[PDB]
Write a protein that binds this ligand. Structure first.
Ligand SMILES: [Br-]
Ligand SMILES: [Br-]
Ligand SMILES: [Br-]
Ligand SMILES: [Br-]
Ligand SMILES: [Br-]
Ligand SMILES: [Br-]
Lengths: 266, 280
């Protein structure tokens, strides 16, 4: 898939302003170097995961100052996909670890609900119209399925859905509005798929004068251990993305993906 | 199969009478099967559904309850089982047995049934999630549903469908002898769930007597609550009590509300950019 790469590739064909900037400041080259260094790491011991994090830090240090200063709102398109593409690298080896061919490992809309909204009494009997609500998540590990409804009139109406085992939101900074929105989604997500792990990953924290809502979210990671308001202050050094957190997150995901979950009895 | 007259109450008597020798003795000695047969025959024989015909169905209902409920109450008691509550259910089956031509389609469900509430996923493991993800349909028992039935199939990468029968209601009605606090709260909770699952389902709570100790006020998602006899369940206790009959005009009001609902176009995209508004 390559979420971040795909955004760059399309902006470079389509957006004259942004393609100019990409060439002049060497974004494509830096991106290529990040991908090539990331995709060649085969193992997932602690050291390998810390190598992925170093390449991630390097890429962000190279490219985020360009996104921030050289693009307008041409760049609240570019920056957020970096973490998403990162997770695709981190979890690109799960097929051989767990012995199954996992179709979803990228941003996707995970199933929330099925409800029925027939046009009329005829329709309700013959072929009831329905809605699958799904929620876009920054990163999902899951399966895809087909959902078919059939009435008396014999034809099946089918919808493709994604069922997550893991879903991760990825943000630069976590503020009040977003964290509340995440806690509401967690509630829906746990009714729909009780065995889905739900993580909110941010680099910076920005809850100011306010108290975080820790609803049904399994973990919140603040990768740089710093407050958002430090960013505009005089001579500011951003902490790197902490490799120990990503190592912790990796282990928790993998532990979850290898376990049993549900059982008619045991 | 298709069947709008399943005789829920008749079926209860018939099974009690085959299985419970004590109860079947009581049935014969006090003429319950005869009174029941008379109720069914008078109900089945009313062909129209104008106001007067609906009042006639209610009179037959009143008569049958007057005949049989004092027997259930005093001669059987806890062996009354599902006996007394099914009368109102069988009643609604009579009331709605002829809707097929008015509405233009044969309605498959018109009986107590579990209407679909939600679909959620509970895979056994990562293998199962990809191949064939296990799931749960939550559904709610209602005393009477007018609705359709559908098949829900989920399929993973390993091809084969896991199928479940569901019922999708257009109307769902709870039927009780008396309405108390616990049941009303439980009904209000179900109404919230029921409106997310099937927003175009009409939801009614019908009882004969009211038993709300508290007059504390709660808005709810129940479309109508009918107290058929307009009395309190505290009068029933008292020395020398005459029960008010089931009021025919309320049942007439309920019938008309159901029929208006079943005739309407519920979801109409083209009828929304026409008007301006989505409702009235
Ligand atoms: Br591939
Ligand atoms: Br595949
Ligand atoms: Br919902
Ligand atoms: Br018949
Ligand atoms: Br009672
Ligand atoms: Br629900």
């Amino acid at each position: 898939v390559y979420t971040h790469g795909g955004k760059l590739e399309r902006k470079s064909k389509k957006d004259k302003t942004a393609s100019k900037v990409f060439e002049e400041f060497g974004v494509m080259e830096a991106y290529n170097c990040w991908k090539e260094a990331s995709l060649c790491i085969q193992q997932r011991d602690k050291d390998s995961v810390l190598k992925l994090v170093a390449a991630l830090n390097t890429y962000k240090d190279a490219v985020e100052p360009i996104f921030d200063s050289r693009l307008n709102s041409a760049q609240e398109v570019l920056q957020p996909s970096i973490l998403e593409e990162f997770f695709e690298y981190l979890f690109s080896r799960i097929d051989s670890i767990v012995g199954v061919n996992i179709p979803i490992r990228h941003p996707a809309k995970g199933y929330l609900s099925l409800s029925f909204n027939p046009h009329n009494i005829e329709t309700l009997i013959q072929s009831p119209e329905y809605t699958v609500r799904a929620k876009d998540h920054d990163f999902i590990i899951g399966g895809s399925a087909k959902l078919t409804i059939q009435g008396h009139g014999g034809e099946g109406e089918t919808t493709n859905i994604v069922v997550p085992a893991v879903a991760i939101e990825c943000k630069r900074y976590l503020e009040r509005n977003m964290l509340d929105e995440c806690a509401g989604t967690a509630e829906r997500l746990k009714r729909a798929t009780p065995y889905c792990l739900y993580f909110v990953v941010a680099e910076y924290l920005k809850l100011d004068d306010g108290a975080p809502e820790l609803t049904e979210i399994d973990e919140i990671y603040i990768l740089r251990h710093q407050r958002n308001s430090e960013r505009n202050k005089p001579g500011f050094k951003p902490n790197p993305i902490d490799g120990e957190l990503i190592w912790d997150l990796y282990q928790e995901v993998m532990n979850h993906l290898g376990k049993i979950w549900w059982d008619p009895n045991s």
